[PDB]
Amino acid sequence: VQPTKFAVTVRQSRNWADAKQRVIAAYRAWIRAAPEIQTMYSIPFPVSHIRTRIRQEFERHRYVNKLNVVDVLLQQSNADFQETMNFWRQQSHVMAFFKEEHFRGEKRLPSNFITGFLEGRN
Amino acid sequence: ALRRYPSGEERCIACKLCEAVCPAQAITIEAEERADGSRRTTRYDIDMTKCIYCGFCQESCPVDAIVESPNAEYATETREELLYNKEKLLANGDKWEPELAAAIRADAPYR
Amino acid sequence: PRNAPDYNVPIDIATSTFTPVPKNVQDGSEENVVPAGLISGAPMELQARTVRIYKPAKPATQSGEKNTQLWRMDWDVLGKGHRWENPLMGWQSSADFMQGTHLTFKTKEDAIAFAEKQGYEYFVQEPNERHFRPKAYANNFLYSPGKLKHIRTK
Amino acid sequence: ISDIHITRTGKPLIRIQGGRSSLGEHTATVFGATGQLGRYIVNRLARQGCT
Amino acid sequence: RYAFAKGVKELRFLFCQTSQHSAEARSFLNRAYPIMKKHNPTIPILLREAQGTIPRVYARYEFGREKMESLEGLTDKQIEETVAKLVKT
Amino acid sequence: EPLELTQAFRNFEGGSSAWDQVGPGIDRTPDTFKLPTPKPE
Amino acid sequence: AEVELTIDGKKVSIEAGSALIQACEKAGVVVPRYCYHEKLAIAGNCRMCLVEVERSPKPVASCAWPVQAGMVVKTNSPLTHKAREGVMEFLLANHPLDCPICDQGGECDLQDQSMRYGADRGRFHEIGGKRAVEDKNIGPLIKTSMNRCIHCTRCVRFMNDIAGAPELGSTGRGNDLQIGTYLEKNLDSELSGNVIDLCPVGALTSKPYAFRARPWELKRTESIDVLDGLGSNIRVDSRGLEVMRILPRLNDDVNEEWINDKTRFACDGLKTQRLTMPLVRRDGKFEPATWEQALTEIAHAYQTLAPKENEFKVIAGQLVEVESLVAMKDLANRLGSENLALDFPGGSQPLAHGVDIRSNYLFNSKIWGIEEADAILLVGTNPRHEAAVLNARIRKQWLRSDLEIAAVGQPWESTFDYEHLGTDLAALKNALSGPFGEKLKKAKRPMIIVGSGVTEHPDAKAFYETVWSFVEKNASNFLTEEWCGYNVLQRAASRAGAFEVGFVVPSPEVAATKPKFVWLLGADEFDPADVPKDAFIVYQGHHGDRGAEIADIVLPGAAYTEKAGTYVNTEGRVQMTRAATGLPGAARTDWKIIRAVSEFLGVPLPYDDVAQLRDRMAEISPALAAYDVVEPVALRHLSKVQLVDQNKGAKVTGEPLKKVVENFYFTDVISRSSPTMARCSAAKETGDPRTNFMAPGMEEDRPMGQIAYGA
Amino acid sequence: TGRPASAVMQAPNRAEVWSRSQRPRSEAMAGPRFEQTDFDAQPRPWAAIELIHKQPVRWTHDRIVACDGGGGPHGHPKIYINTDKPEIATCNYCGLPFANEHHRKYLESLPQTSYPLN
Ligand SMILES: NC(=O)C1=CN([C@@H]2O[C@H](COP(=O)(O)OP(=O)(O)OC[C@H]3O[C@@H](n4cnc5c(N)ncnc54)[C@H](OP(=O)(O)O)[C@@H]3O)[C@@H](O)[C@H]2O)C=CC1
Ligand code: SF4
Ligand code: SF4
Ligand code: SF4
Ligand code: SF4
Ligand code: FES
Ligand SMILES: [Zn+2]
Structure with missing residues (x-):
């Protein structure tokens, strides 16, 4: 806020009820900003595709049961959110977040044993 | 440049002191016994796009084999021309030897 | 599923053709263990690869034991991508970003604790210890009641 | 699709699949690569470590 | 004390050396193995031990089919009957 | 893209001396911060 | 009776x-040394370890001084500082300025202890110059630069006391005292390359290693040797793609700081005859194929032939790990086959010893057991050629005790004196009923050691019955709580691992079936009768050799330096290699080839990761999960059902025991492709002692030199 | 990729490689990168192995001979060479040949020597 546009002072969560509000607050800001993110970096994907990525990022950490670890993830989310909504990231940075735009594909690991073996460890 | 003795034998004996001290890891060396059994290099490369021109190799060499010539006018069209192998470096020493000996002659008392 | 490889793990931007398929990625729900590997920023690959935890043996070429004092953590070399010959210069290229990295620990519980916290697979190699036997100079000159059996030369 | 490609004339190409520094094994000539389409074939080959 | 069915390719007994578990598997093998190896002499009866190993028995059937049975907390007589199921048909 | 080095980094850390080269050093705690010692007898 | 003493003001206790x-080492005090080595006799000649001892006027050699009840030792006094500086000055006065050209540089104890314990500058500036000494030819393996010699005596003491080769010595006197053979001769020990490591200086260096690398550029991987059955602990030094040298690391249980010459010098064979891509033979000539193309032709040729039970045969070679044998046993069983054979004569037949009890085939008294042995009988084994580091362990106990050795089998030139009782099964029975049986009966710690060539003998069933019946008759001597007297010695790294997982042909019925499909799992010493000519041969391995050339499909596998593999040595110790380099070309991990062929054969193995295969190993044998220990055998007495009861009625031919190692240098695929082993074989045959015999360098009749190594 | 003699000869004064791991120039300077190139313009230093063997044997009566390359501080570290074997002794730094006068008749008898002897 005061230092720069989307700056959030680093604070610990008081309890699990406090943490959950921040996590939902963080998700709400992210998926709300998805229309702006598309037109601001000229992303060649629909807001639906972008918003799915937001949920998966939040779902990788759905099973965390440690309060200190949540505070770390919340601070990372605020830092990524600020550097996105401020035009500090470049199209290369945001585009790299979408795993489909790598010339070797998104399925960058072998499907099963025999496809990886026939190609040579993937 | 890579230098010779007055007889024309290579000064380099593959000690690897210049490869170890190099602050930028610009030198790559391979070596075995030569056909006559002499300790000599088979590969002596300097990546001139990694080299920071600090003189540490020239300071570390016990035989005065690797030296920096006074030459600075060798800008190239392609980056590949700045990957010096042993042939390029020994040719440089052959061409620049009278300067190399004169520069060594003047400063060796301080080295 | 009892050491089954999870062929459906999400990839990250450092996932390459040389990355092995992991078994167990941290989720932040493991009991009693800080999930550093979840928040470190390190690629998924480091939870798929195995580190070796060992005391380096004394070199056979020297008597100094300075480098055997500490515990070493090292990454095993993969089948593909560790080294190959660059066609231009003959240099040795690598796709293994861990090839020149090692970690030093005062005790192996420390090394194990760090490895569990990051989520590395690890293998602990215990150090072989010398078997003590007293040595005496005077044993070079023991009286032989019988055939000498060996002729000593100082 | 693999670490081995055998060419029409039989050459075996043991290939290390990767990026810029990898070994694609193919040597290709592309006539008229300075036009609109030549940049997409040259780019695809070179970034696989092909000559 | 009889030869097993034609399906039995091999038997595998895994046990420990200490008294962490019982000594019933060890006593049973002390007795069973000589006569079992006797009546049908061409069946590999592998006795493999290791510190801390829960007692088990494996029976290999045709085409790589196996059945395992835990011998923990089991007296030798029950161990004797546990093997009997794996070998008679 | 995933990192790929044309020449891999060469770590010469293994050339560290097989013998300790510094030693334990010297104690320089002042006397006003070392404990007193019992006198003989 | 540990006495108590004071070193540097801190108390330490040690045996009188x-x-x-x-x-000092027990107390953690570092003492400089050159002559002293823990495994050699004390010398006291270098003078580096002089320390101050209370009530002692002269500074004292800490390597030769006995510990007393109450001595006080000062290792960091001015007197000790002055002694080390002065001794280092004398060591460097005549030492040649050769560190740029010396191969010890960067791993030199003279350089490290000069930096640590000596002065920074020298005071020898004599116009008369330094001593210079002529070089010596002592064979093809050891390059000599004798000016560097500091006269520690380590190479003489090792070669004489440890290796049993009294050809190295020292001649002359004073400053002119010179180490060498007084007359130029090859050093005939398979333990000779240990002097290179023992040498603190670069006076004795490895000829094949000469000038190739600096020590700081080498990645150091601790691993296990697989060219022998002892599993010697080794350090593999590599520079990216290339393995450059093999060094021994300390394991007092198995190899005791030493390795043999083939273990050391066969590493150059790892880069010359290598299988790097699949080959399909066609029109009588091998042709390159993809891995899909090769596995397809296995699947097609399997269907076309439709093998029945035991028409699928697998032969395992000497360098095969347990992962490959377990995965291949799972595959062969799913094809109906129990035809699992080994690479030696009679390997395709059921073995005279069984595999039901681990003690049937293992070295039961452990390698460490030799340190306490009172009497040893060696049946059908030349231990110098089959287990050389274990052979030197027998000499060490023989030198320092009243240990009696006898042998039944082919005589060999030995480093210890032994009583040759005969060469055949008749001689074994006479021995056990003769005077040496009396020695065995009235001895604590008796040992009977049976070679792996007895297992390949036609009378093998009568040998194990003869031996074990003696073990049972004289138990409470051979079969006690602290001791097992019966031992089987494996010269190959894979045999005990194969036995552990039951990788053997169970019955003569399986042995009788003539195979249609034969899988050579790294097999190259197979008999040319266990491989029928009209069978589809598949070779999987790392080296193009005998096995690969007669095959229909060649699959490139991995060598021991390119994989983490599980090996079981002759005593049952489970050990794991560590990969130093990656796979070359299009090669694959050996167990993954078998797992990949199983999908193509329609019987996909359950395991996809090596951790799942390693769980399967514990189900077959739980001791395979315990690395670097030897799990004791609980039911030792049960080694009578298969060694006596099943072996009671066996035909006896009386044929002599044999020599399973015709030539030590050529034993496996790696050593047969080694250019260095070729020089050793050539030099032994022609008696040439010159260093440059088939190597680069000037020679009197070769003034232009030569680039070739190994030719 | 090379027809001219600069593209085949390992050096102007030596056709053949002088170490086993040395890449022959004919294979090294082959491939697409050497297509439209002047080969005489490429760096081709003279082989040092051929030049050092033109050096005549420095005869001496003393058993031990010092060699530092002859530049004083401009050479190599001073080492001492033993000439007692009946052969030409060579400095391990600079390759200079040395021989004792005791061995002159046997060295003159030799059909061919590594060094000219005169
Ligand atoms: N683009 C399209 O929509 C269609 C294209 N095509 C074909 O596709 C191919 C590639 O198309 P595109 O890349 O768009 O074409 P461009 O016109 O963009 O490029 C054509 C290429 O031809 C080279 N070229 C033309 N004339 C000569 C000449 N006389 N000598 C040497 N080189 C010459 C040009 O080199 P330089 O730059 O030096 O002139 C250039 O690299 C061509 O064969 C074209 O005919 C056909 C149907 C549709
Ligand atoms: S240039 Fe000098 S320092 Fe480098 S290897 Fe040659 S002799 Fe040693
Ligand atoms: S001048 Fe260049 S090559 Fe020589 S040490 Fe400095 S960086 Fe390395
Ligand atoms: S032995 Fe040690 S001090 Fe002597 S030249 Fe070799 S590295 Fe230098
Ligand atoms: S040659 Fe080496 S090991 Fe032998 S006495 Fe001299 S310094 Fe010691
Ligand atoms: S170590 Fe004691 S005198 Fe050499
Ligand atoms: Zn010289």
Whole structure:
């Protein structure tokens, strides 16, 4: 806020009820900003595709049961959110977040044993 | 440049002191016994796009084999021309030897 | 599923053709263990690869034991991508970003604790210890009641 | 699709699949690569470590 | 004390050396193995031990089919009957 | 893209001396911060 | 009776009769040394380890001084500082300025202890110059630069006391005293390359290693040797793609700081005859194929032939790990086959010893057991050629005790004196009923050691019955709580691992079936009768050799330096290699080839990761999960059902025991492709002692030199 | 990729490689990168192995001979060479040949020597 546009002072969560509000607050800001993110970096994907990525990022950490670890993830989310909504990231940075735009594909690991073996460890 | 003795034998004996001290890891060396059994290099490369021109190799060499010539006018069209192998470096020493000996002659008392 | 490889793990931007398929990625729900590997920023690959935890043996070429004092953590070399010959210069290229990295620990519980916290697979190699036997100079000159059996030369 | 490609004339190409520094094994000539389409074939080959 | 069915390719007994578990598997093998190896002499009866190993028995059937049975907390007589199921048909 | 080095980094850390080269050093705690010692007898 | 002493003001306790330097090491005190080595006799000649001892006027050699009840030792006094500086000055006065050209540089104890304990500058500026000494030819393996010699005596003491090769010595006197053979001759020990490591200086260096690398550029991987059955602990030094040298690491249980010459010098064979891509033979000539193309032709040729039970045969070679044998046993069983054979004569037949009890085939008294052995009988084994580091362990106990050795089988030139009782099964029975049986009966710690060539003998069933019946008759001597007297010695790294997982042909019925499909799992010493000519041969391995050339499909596998593999040595110790380099070309991990062929054969193995295969190993044998220990055998007495009861009625031919190693240098695929082993074989045959015999260098009749190594 | 003699000869004064791991120039300077190139313009230093063997044997009566390359501080570290074997002794730094006068008749008898002897 005061230092720069989307700056959030680093604070610990008081309890699990406090943490959950921040996590939902963080998700709400992210998926709300998805229309702006598309037109601001000229992303060649629909807001639906972008918003799915937001949920998966939040779902990788759905099973965390440690309060200190949540505070770390919340601070990372605020830092990524600020550097996105401020035009500090470049199209290369945001585009790299979408795993489909790598010339070797998104399925960058072998499907099963025999496809990886026939190609040579993937 | 890579230098010779007055007889024309290579000064380099593959000690690897210049490869170890190099602050930028610009030198790559391979070596075995030569056909006559002499300790000599088979590969002596300097990546001139990694080299920071600090003189540490020239300071570390016990035989005065690797030296920096006074030459600075060798800008190239392609980056590949700045990957010096042993042939390029020994040719440089052959061409620049009278300067190399004169520069060594003047400063060796301080080295 | 009892050491089954999870062929459906999400990839990250450092996932390459040389990355092995992991078994167990941290989720932040493991009991009693800080999930550093979840928040470190390190690629998924480091939870798929195995580190070796060992005391380096004394070199056979020297008597100094300075480098055997500490515990070493090292990454095993993969089948593909560790080294190959660059066609231009003959240099040795690598796709293994861990090839020149090692970690030093005062005790192996420390090394194990760090490895569990990051989520590395690890293998602990215990150090072989010398078997003590007293040595005496005077044993070079023991009286032989019988055939000498060996002729000593100082 | 693999670490081995055998060419029409039989050459075996043991290939290390990767990026810029990898070994694609193919040597290709592309006539008229300075036009609109030549940049997409040259780019695809070179970034696989092909000559 | 009889030869097993034609399906039995091999038997595998895994046990420990200490008294962490019982000594019933060890006593049973002390007795069973000589006569079992006797009546049908061409069946590999592998006795493999290791510190801390829960007692088990494996029976290999045709085409790589196996059945395992835990011998923990089991007296030798029950161990004797546990093997009997794996070998008679 | 995933990192790929044309020449891999060469770590010469293994050339560290097989013998300790510094030693334990010297104690320089002042006397006003070392404990007193019992006198003989 | 550990006495109590003071070193540098801190108290240490150690056994009486121990050297002071041993107490300093126990106390953690670092003492410089050159002549002293823990495995050699004390010399006391270098003068580096002089320390101050209370009530002693002269400074004292801490390697030779005995520990006493109450001595006080000062290792960091001015007197000790002055002694080390002065001794280092004398060591460097005549030492040649050769560190740029010396191969010890960067791993030199003279350089490290000069930096640590000596002065920074020298005071020898004599116009008369330094001593210079002529070089010596002592064979093809050891390059000599004798000016560097500091006269520690380590190479003489090792070669004489340890290796049993009294050809190295020292001639002359004073400053002109010179180490060498007084007359130029090859050093005939398979343990000779240990002097290179023992040498503190670069006076004795490896000829094949000469000038190739600096020590700081080498990745150091601790691993296990697989060219022998002892599993010697080794350090593999590599520079990216290339393995450059093999060094021994300390394991007092198995190899005791030493390795043999083939273990050391066969590493150059790892880069010359290598299988790097699949080959499909066609129109009588091998042709390259993809891995899909090769596995398809296995699947097609399997269907076309439709093998029945035991028409699928697998032969395992000497360098095969347990992962490959377990995955291949799972595959062969799913094809109906129990035809699992080994690479030696009679390997395709059921073995005279069984595999039901681990003690049937293992070295039961452990390698460490030799340190306490009172009497040893060696049946059908030349231990110098089959287990050389274990052979030197027998000499060491023989030198320091009243240990009696006898042998039944082919005589060999031995490093210990032994009583040759005969060469056949008749001689074994006479021995056990003769005077040496009396020696065995009235001895604590008796040992009977049976070679792996007895297992390949036609009378093998009568040998194990003869031996074990003696073990049972004289138990409470051979079969006690602290001791097992019966031992089987494996010269190959894979045999005990194969036995552990039951990788053997169970019955003569399986042995009788003539195979249609034969899988050579790294097999190259197979008999040319266990491989029928009209069978589809598949070779999987790392080296193009005998096995690969007669095959229909060649699959490139991995060598021991390119994989983490599980190996079981002759005593049952489970050990794991560590990969130093990656796979070359299009090669694959050996167990993954078998797992990949199983999908193509329609019987996909359950395991996809090596951790799942390693769980399967514990189900077959749980001791395979315990690395670097030897799990004791609980039911030792049960080694009578298969060694006596099943072996009671066996035909006896009386044929002599044999020599399973015709030539030590050529034993496996790696050593047969080694250019260095070729020089050793050539030099032994022609008696040439010159260093440059088939190597680069000037020679009198070769003034232009030559680039070739190994030719 | 090379027809001219600069593209085949390992050096102007030596056709053949002088170490086993040395890449022959004919294979090294082959491939697409050497297509439209002047080969005489490429760096081709003279082989040092051929030049050092033109050096005549420095005869001496003393058993031990010092060699530092002859530049004083401009050479190599001073080493001492033993000439007692009946052969030409060579400095391990600079390759200079040395021989004792005791061995002159046997060295003159030799059909061919590594060094000219005169
Ligand atoms: N683009 C399209 O929509 C269609 C294209 N095509 C074909 O596709 C191919 C590639 O198309 P595109 O890349 O768009 O074409 P461009 O016109 O963009 O490029 C054509 C290429 O031809 C080279 N070229 C033309 N004339 C000569 C000449 N006389 N000598 C040497 N080189 C010459 C040009 O080199 P330089 O730059 O030096 O002139 C250039 O690299 C061509 O064969 C074209 O005919 C056909 C149907 C549709
Ligand atoms: S240039 Fe000098 S320092 Fe480098 S290897 Fe040659 S002799 Fe040693
Ligand atoms: S001048 Fe260049 S090559 Fe020589 S040490 Fe400095 S960086 Fe390395
Ligand atoms: S032995 Fe040690 S001090 Fe002597 S030249 Fe070799 S590295 Fe230098
Ligand atoms: S040659 Fe080496 S090991 Fe032998 S006495 Fe001299 S310094 Fe010691
Ligand atoms: S170590 Fe004691 S004198 Fe050499
Ligand atoms: Zn010289």
